[PDB]
Amino acid sequence: GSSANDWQCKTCSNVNWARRSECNMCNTPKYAK
Ligand SMILES: [Zn+2]
């Protein structure tokens, strides 16, 4: 989650898919900030 491809949730700190739109655990949008 430091490369512009695979991202990491800001809530659970778990990396979803290498291009997911949102978290499946927290339902956090990719980058809602
Ligand atoms: Zn999450």
UniProtKB/Swiss-Prot annotation:
A zinc finger (RanBP2-type) spans 3-32. The modification N6-acetyllysine is found at K30. Transmembrane segments: none annotated. It is found in: Nucleus. It comes from the Eukaryota. Belongs to the ZRANB2 family. Splice factor required for alternative splicing of TRA2B/SFRS10 transcripts. Binds to ssRNA containing the consensus sequence 5'-AGGUAA-3'. May interfere with constitutive 5'-splice site selection. The RanBP2-type zinc fingers mediate binding to RNA. This is Zinc finger Ran-binding domain-containing protein 2. It comes from Homo sapiens. The gene is ZRANB2.
